[model samples]
Target chain A: TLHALLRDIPAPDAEAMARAQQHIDGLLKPPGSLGRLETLAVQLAGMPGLNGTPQVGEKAVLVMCADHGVWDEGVAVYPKIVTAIMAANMTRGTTGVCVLAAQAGAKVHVIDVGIDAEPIPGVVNMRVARGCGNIAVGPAMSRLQAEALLLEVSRYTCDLAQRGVTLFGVGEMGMANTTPAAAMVSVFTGSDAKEVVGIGANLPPSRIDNKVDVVRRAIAINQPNPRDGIDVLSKVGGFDLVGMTGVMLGAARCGLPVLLDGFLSYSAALAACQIAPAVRPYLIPSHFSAEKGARIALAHLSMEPYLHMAMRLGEGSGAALAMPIVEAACAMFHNMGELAASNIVLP
Target chain B: TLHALLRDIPAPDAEAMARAQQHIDGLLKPPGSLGRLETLAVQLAGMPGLNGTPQVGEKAVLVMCADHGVWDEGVAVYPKIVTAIMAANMTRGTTGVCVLAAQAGAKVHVIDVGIDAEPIPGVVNMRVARGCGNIAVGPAMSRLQAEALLLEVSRYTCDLAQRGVTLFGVGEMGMANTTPAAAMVSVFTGSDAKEVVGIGANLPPSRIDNKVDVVRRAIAINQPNPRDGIDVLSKVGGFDLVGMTGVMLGAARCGLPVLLDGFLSYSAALAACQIAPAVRPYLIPSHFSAEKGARIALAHLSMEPYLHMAMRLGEGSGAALAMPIVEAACAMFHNMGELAASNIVLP
Candidate 1:
């Protein structure tokens, strides 16, 4: 059932992209000079309902909040409880993401997919579990619960799209979540744990080995099947990560663009692509994360990152910073005077 | 006189940057998780006016308009007349930069430094010449006019700072201006004309060699002294490019951060650094241009670009998109609660 929902993502319109390119070519500047913005504008043009006149109108940033049971492995530098506190901070518009979202004119929506703590004010409660089971010790969560969580995000994204929000960016809040993400990447790429696990949250030099070993143990114990998208996610993914997968899929179905944030969001993108290869077209790659795994994951997806400031903060902050660029692209695409109309000869 | 004005640019505070780093280390996420934003935040922290708490209060984008005499050498795809027409559109709030500035809440100030045609209403008139002399044939402008234009921009930036603007970005509208920029790079960095020349407004491939030859001839005929900033600028620089250099230098003097736009802005940045090495810290790199010379220029300044969309259209559109990121950084630097304040453990 979960796979079926992922299967129906609407394909971007080829005709619309070609039309958008013609308009871009007629603009005052040299062709392809807008660089990735040209491509992104064309991509936005192809979004199903937009009819090629690109727009990133109202923006919504979904900050998925969850907690990883992998904290038991002592894999991260920060304590697990920071996830709860940070989620509350995010709701109050005090976190880094909130500050940026405010500047970018996007609403920050904190979703408790599986945060360990009880419901916090201003955060939408959509819990699948109190927290995921330690992947090093057991499967992170059951397949049924994972499917339900995935479906929930799909419905959630569809609702937002219907509410006139055209642009979406997904980020997360989960302690020790990168450990599980690393485990998932190792499953998909067969990459070594040492290569996929990074110094998340500035882990101590002495604890680097312990973190890598934890990912290795998690993969070995769960043996997440690369061929089965849901199985890999259920075995080695946190609720927030898997929920992001659903967000991309549902956004694709609703014909909306989703902006990808830093490392953990890239991890979710990898899993999203695994679930539905078509979801890639709906995604916009944002800042390149400082994490070792981000590049590896993005390489697997064959996407080029637009910004490279080593941003690793999750709560959609990187995506928030990038949102205006997309808006700027749409602005130029729709508002620029045609070279002919301005009585100017083509360059 | 131009060199003297540039020489007075104040140095950024190393102590404030170090202090900002201390607070960044205590934030909830991993150290440097904010990536370049953290560095940018620290940079703002060190700004003379903001102290440790950063703020990007008021913003002004200087869209310097001019006409390049090199258009007579057949180096550009568009006609020289388009310069005056486009400047009129920009003043009417109908250009790409206008749309973005409207969204970013920044005022667009179009300055006609040296257009061949008479000025229209709304564009600030600051003409130095009808246009620079055809550089391929001889020096573009006299040393005296160069000094006046440079000082004019310095005083303008000071006026904005006194009016309460804290952030600035410089952009240009000049036909065939890249010819002189390439020549300036040749003079400053000893790079060959062919290496620094790029397609401006989509020049034909057959004409590219001619464009390079124009730059070479300009350098040879003008015989600009590389050691003397004014000599080099007077001989080979367009009014717009040199004006941007002054804007950067003046912004530094005013303790404001200047966001660099696309390629020509980077060329100005290279020239600014040549004029006063201390101006580098006050500059924030924005989009990477599609021009080949842009990378060489930025690398020469030892600055990494934040946005990598191959935007070549100047008019400060790229900088407008990047303005919010700077604002977001200031917001986080001022508003985010410390890990200690939230009772959360640091990594």
Candidate 2:
């Protein structure tokens, strides 16, 4: 199903990017004075719409939620019930991401992909399963189930795309989900679980070491094929991760930019990239997560995060914060006047 | 006169800063997660306010405009007339800073401290002189005149303070002003002009090197005393530089925060610090200026800049962008709910 979805992913318009660079070069400031912002504008130019003026008209963060079975392995500091609590409150707009999302004038679209609790109010119900199996001992989900979840993500993204949503940030919420992400990253990068595991939810040092052990055992038990992204995800990834990976692929298929949130999104994106290498250009890293493995995983993908404020909070806070900077970069092209037209001197 | 202003410069509130740190530590996110924004909150706590809640209610940038006689020294790439032209545009809300200032909900108060042109509408006509003497040949202005101009800055800030404008950023516009700024920075830090000089106003490689020569000759001819801040300003500074320095001193005296813009503002702040060493805490460096000496001067004052976007457009655009981050920092103190209150897990 994912392969079918990946069949028509649009290639970046190099011609449009070239045109954007020429326009940026003609802006009032010096060539490359805006630095990374200038670079981002050119990248946006390649996207659909007004030549080079990147329209971040309707920005939204798709926060995929789930309940991870890895919680049974003593991998998380929080209980499984906290996932539903946080996700529910997230819909109510009371969390940290909610505050920043309000500040940034963005919407937080909460979708329950696989939470153990009953159907909640406000959160979009798109549950793939009640919960995944504990990857520390066995496969988390079947390959067919993973593919089906991905299709759901793609379907939801396509729906949003129809509503004039062009720019996106994929966020997630799942207790003990980092264990699956860590296990998946270990399989992808061929690194030790200790190298990828971090203290998710502020776990103590002893428990963090246990988390490393859990990821290691999860990978060893799953024995998922590294070359097949679906194999890796089906055996050890959380439904939230699979869903976000689908959203990323879906965004690429829709010819839009999907700004990626913290470590889990990056982990899922790594899976998406494995499925379709072209999606790398469509994925914009919002910020580098303080998680231990985030750096290595992002570096493997060759993505430079825009903000590095040592943030680890989820719900797309970093992504939401980054939207303003992206909007400002787009505004620079339209708002800044040319010096020659204004008859102004260089100094 | 500067001594009279510095005499009543309020001391920072240690208790308020301590209380703010405690509040920030208790926010929903992980400790020290917000990085520089957290540091900014503590700094804001030290200001006169509701203890830790920083009131960025009325924010404004005091754009100090002038004309430099140093333009005759072959120091600038653009003609001197462009200063008045750009300054006029800045007042009409058409410049880069104007766009960002509007976006940030901040005001741009264009003050003509020493433009060579006749008094124009929109710009506050408060000329210190028609223009200063060329620093490469002799002193730019008398020390008494420098003190009086600083008093003018103190007076303007007091006016803004009366109108409830507590948070401020000092911007500047003047042709060939960076030459005097480089010269002023060199004298204060006892560094070589080559180390301080940069390609101001998009100067070519030839003019950049020539800018170094200009600074050296200006300092050699003037022989400004490093211990005497007034001597440095009167000898090798423009009215734009002098007036902004006055703004910093004025802001400090008003018990408000003053964000310093690029190298010119930093050069002015260096002189302000020499006049009132205690004003260092009140000054917030918006970004590390692309100009070379900005870092040296900021380091000399033991200040760390927040944003490093390679931005060299000096009209308080950087400061306006930084205000959102500042407001977010303040919001974190009050808005974010405590985890204990919500009965939620950390992950």
Candidate 3:
């Protein structure tokens, strides 16, 4: 859900703001008492027609699924194949989307950008060169290949935009993808990759170091362009990484708000944002996912996510969870009535 | 969402467990490395037929709303009417469902079970009378009304069940609902309500004392039966409180998972569980709400919620936001393959 809907969401008018503020001031507490409420006030002001926020009517998310190469050295409990399998599972639409997207009336689209098996028909298969290259060997994707992945993303965006979609979200399925995400954060932000490496499969210290070494080797081998940024990803990114970058860029280009998921998605956003600085305004960090790299990326983005509830699972679900505010921001901006227009006093 | 669904969602057979666990153990990471995975494995074993969790289908939050007479003393920032206004707002379907619910593909059915404006049509309105008698004056509701409210909650459960809802959530809309919640927590758990009594809407020091004194008076006036918690509720409860209690029992009876929202919902859940110990099996504390007593209640329940997002919003949105894991939990349970089953060897 994007807050950009403020242009359409009915917001409280100046008079209504005046009244809501009056009630707030009249409350038992002193002046400027409620911080959240004050934020609410500012948000209300952004609503359409000073009428209050509009109820978020349509919500759509783009999930980028892939597998990381680092899993080969024992970083996580699950193998890199799980990434492809999960992507396959998601495309089948037999499970996850049924539950997480069913209630919100969301439309879940499956994308098999890079997986071992051929995708089923009607499934959007972008194929970022059948998963990423071996990071331990070289860069994840070449600049040329990354652009090709972005081309597919642009097509997806065009399709989604045709339906009047406004909110865009990123979800990914990749093996050892976090290794790359953390590496990018570590190298890009000057943090220790060792400190950020997580319990992927509960691998041993030696295996962990091997994983870190994999990142360093890829950084040295690929040596992507720093000027255009995102060299870190291309030098050694996952299949899902390139696809997610497109999702963010394309969504912003389409003027939809992109809600970002955890480590991988955040990294992809950074990559995409680097390519186009104007796209930065179209995103919101969904949560401070439990990944240290995610924390670093969030800090780099200069935006504070609403919560830090120790979540590490990827798939844009956290971003999905944060969509409520997007919906609220829309409604608060448009649907809510102005106190002055209704001749009502603030409570 | 209730992770127990893996056990009972579809009544998985013995082989299902073997297959699911085997599947998870087979995913790529170092074997036996995901610490929280053991629990995930058990759930998958019980459910057996999905790639991941399949139960989290929708969001149905039960918002029990009412007000207090203490507001008359100007102890709080806003007037008691704000309770009804917020309650009405929920019914209006303007704020609509919490953003998290939308992100997670859930919907919220505004429960105006008890409000002053004679229960609006289309909303889940019932005649439990206006907000509880000002707790400051005496007990909020009578024993009968309070008991009736708890029973009425089943309606929410039944409604969602009819739609095959897999997850249920609890939220409150009454003005000053926290007062009742804090007071109830103190009475049952026997903690310091004053410390738990945060500056709701930011009230003055003297007003805070007044709120505390009112709670003490209620405790003194109504020597509630911790045994017949419903009796205790009616003895010193509000319309919103009673309705929320009903929401808890209702979800339990309907067998839907209830994600308790913030501080207010915590108290409501605590009260509901006390009334019916059986409800605990279906309840999933969604967050460690920002309120202090909320943690106390969590300790009392001996349950640690999955998220500690520091949310104090009583609208059920926070719980809604923390829901991606519901599916992730299911995904791990059904999708990942075990080492032996996966035709892979242990690291």
Candidate 4:
């Protein structure tokens, strides 16, 4: 299924981008006056589904939820049970992601890939297991399980694209998930665990050293292959990260842009891009997370986030906040007038 | 009149801000997880009119338009006539500010503060004069003309607040305006002309030396008093900058927040802050301008812009683009569920 999906993914349409650039340049301002927005508009225009002018249609945030067995390491400040609780709260439209998505005119879809708790009533259930092995001690999951989770979530995301979801944002809710994310980032970026480990959810300064040590132990114990994304995912990544990676691949396969949330989503995006390098352009970075590893992860991907609010929330909050910016970029491309129409002469 | 306006401006309501912070910390996320959005929410909450919870209501972008005598020095790439053309187009909803304002659900109000042309139809007729004196040779305007423009625009802004404009954004459209803005920034920041001047509207690299030299000459010729904002405005500022400073003062007096565009708006804001330090809290920065002096100006003000799109279009385009983010911040404050209600336990 992964091979089939990779085969279906298409490259950005350069002809469409050229048309977008021409129209944007002709707008009643200096050429490239809109800055990153102009680049975003052209990128959206080049997407296979959008013909030259990209329109922001129905937007959805896929909040992938799961649990990490690494909680035994006491790396995070929050209890692991908070993951399922927040996942269910998202379904009630009462979480940070819910309110922000409402503001951006986007819907929130919470899915439980492997939360330790029982099935959430409203969350889409595609659980692979209650939780995976502790990365500090052993592999996070079997290679077969990682591949199954990826293919399943990818299919689900493709179904969403078929149902009129024009834009997708990938978010995650899992306790101690940042540990696995940091581990993967350390592996992918070839940075030491100390460089990538951060105080997830406000861990005490004293405990940071312990968390960093735990990350190093996980990396050394698992010994994930740098070139094989699946090996890395099965070794040190969380189910939520795997699910988000699937969404990125599926979104790219369906010719839609995916807004990536901070650190964890960056890890997922890194893995997705590794699995299929063609998925790179479909990824739209949303915010610069305050997490320590976020910069390293983003640098490795060669992408820049639009918002720098210092937000470290993981439930798609940054992506939701950035939706209007994306919409505004598209609106600029579609609605701005040509310079000739404005009768404004240059030197 | 300025003194009376300053007297009416009150400091941010600490009690309201405390109440807002309490609520934000209780929201179903890690404390400080929302980052700058949380700070924005707290700031908006402290505004006098909004009580404790800030609500984003009818928003307006004041596109204060004018022309600079510095145009004679060939500081900009575009012709001076483009100012009036773009201002009129803004009034007709055909310019960059217009399209962006529409996207942010804000109305654009173009005011002819000092355009060197006949009154443009459909634009608000607030013309202070045909234009100002060339700063390269003499004062930009008489001290009395500067005061009159400030009082007039401030009154207009107060009236808008009375009419239920909950939020305001300051933008400007004036050819070669960056020259005067750079001059004011250099004066206020005590920086050299070369440190503050940038190529306006993409001037050729060869002309940058000439632009910086022109700015230096303007400061040297005017000898504006940095301590007195009115003296600075009359000596080296454009009518549009004076008008925006008035709007800032007026908005602060009305206890309403004002979004500032880029470098030119920063110059105006610096002037406003100098005039009345109490007005500082009401000012919200929008985007980092691509112009060279923006960072220096923002640093002096102790404010950071929300967006960093490398935009330098002026005319309030950056502020308009930032409106939705402001709205989202307010919405998050008003809408998110309390952590206690979410059944999620912290450590």
Best model per lDDT: 4
Q: List the residue pairs that clash in candidate 1.
A: A33-B310, A35-B310
| Per-candidate alpha-carbon RMSD to the true structure | 2.0, 3.1, 7.9, 1.1
Poorest lDDT segment (10 consecutive residues) of candidate 2 chain A: A47-56
Alpha-carbon shift of residue A194 in model 3 (angstroms): 1.5
lDDT of 2 by residue, B1-347 (tens): 56677898888888889988887777766566666667888888897632345657788898889988889978877777777878878866667777777767789999999988877788987788887889989989988888898998788886798787878988988878889999989999999999999877777887787778889899888889999898999999988898998888888888788888888988999999998887888898776778878889888888766666667777777777677667766666667776666675345
Worst 10 residues of 1 chain B by lDDT: B1-10
lDDT of 2 by residue, A1-347 (tens): 56677888878888888888887777665566566667888888786532345667787788989988889878877778878888878866766777777777788899998999998898999898888888988988898899998988887886787787878889888888888999888899888888899776677787887888888888878898989998999999989999899889888887788888888988899899998887877888877788889988998889877666667777677777677777777777667776776675444
Clashing pairs in 4: none
Score chain A of each prediction against the true chain A by TM-score and list the results: 0.97, 0.96, 0.79, 0.98
Query: Can you list each candidate's DockQ?
Result: 0.67, 0.42, 0.14, 0.82
lDDT of 1 by residue, A110-154 (tens): 999998888888789999888899888899899998889889898
Alpha carbon lDDT at A155, candidate 1: 86
- lDDT against the true structure, per candidate, is 0.84, 0.81, 0.60, 0.89
Q: After TM-score superposition, what is the CA distance of residue A97 in candidate 1 from its true location, in Å?
A: 1.6
| Every model's TM-score on chain B | 0.96, 0.96, 0.83, 0.98
- What does the interface RMSD come to for each candidate? 1.9, 2.9, 6.6, 1.2
